[PDB]
Design a protein around this ligand. Sequence first.
Ligand SMILES: [Cl-]
Ligand code: NA
Length: 339
Amino acid sequence: MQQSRPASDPQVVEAARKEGRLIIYSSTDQSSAQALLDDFRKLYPFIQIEYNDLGTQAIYDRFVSETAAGASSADLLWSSAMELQVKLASEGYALPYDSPEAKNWPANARLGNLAYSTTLEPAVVVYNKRFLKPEEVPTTREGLARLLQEPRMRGRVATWDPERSAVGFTILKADYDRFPAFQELARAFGKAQAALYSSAGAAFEKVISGEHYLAYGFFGSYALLRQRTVKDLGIAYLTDGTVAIQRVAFINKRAAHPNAAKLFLDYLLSLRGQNLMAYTALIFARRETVVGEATPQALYKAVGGKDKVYAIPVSTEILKNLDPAERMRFLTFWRQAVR
Ligand SMILES: [Cl-]
Ligand code: NA
């Protein structure tokens, strides 16, 4: 597929040949990233990749620690912890680089030339079809608050613990900040005795076993990936408004192999990389021209229009989520509503 190679500066490519190495610190499971890594190496066979698959807090702590120690660290950081990525990229850790693959990124998908969105992943409802049929799974927060009044739903609901999950915090806080109906729905998680999880895996186990029937606020990427082998898992998309996270990539200012990192960033943003990510990894692409289920065009059809998707922006505005007063107001609401 020579016609689909990423746009590249020839000087970057020549400097990447001399570097011949790329160190990535990433939150993305290597077995999901593997097809992108294999396809990037076919495009640029002269690069050796070290892919470090780490938890989001681990990436932040390690990179900050190594930098402070003057140590060799990563060339490229790729993480679903939006606030931690935007914090690093707005505190002097990022290499400014205008990606030739990002010319049509919306301003809210890039921190200028410091960091880029690589995904647009919606928070969805998942449910066990043996216990809830698609026609009775509400697609609005008011509808879900009503369903959760039913005694058959008591102890049958999962959501995030925003006190034990950074991504869980980001997604539920985005919901609370944007949708008044969220407050009714949080109260209904209290009524239904919602179980709160620090990971999607722990929450989905219970939904697949039928110990829970429904889970709220987990991401569509993971839900599609589990659904590929669990035919009882249903996905519903919220039509009153969907919140979506964006996995953020940036190049280390102090990268030993900055030109290799530029090629990898361009690849991740390109149609070739975004297509392959949607198709093989079932990670919802950022790029609007991707065709398939895990894509913006499919998401917009499912929710009833692009205007019903709120992307959490790749912007310093999201650092209010780290402000202790803002955190205390949300968490004191949350803990009262759900317990
Ligand atoms: Cl390699
Ligand atoms: Na390039």
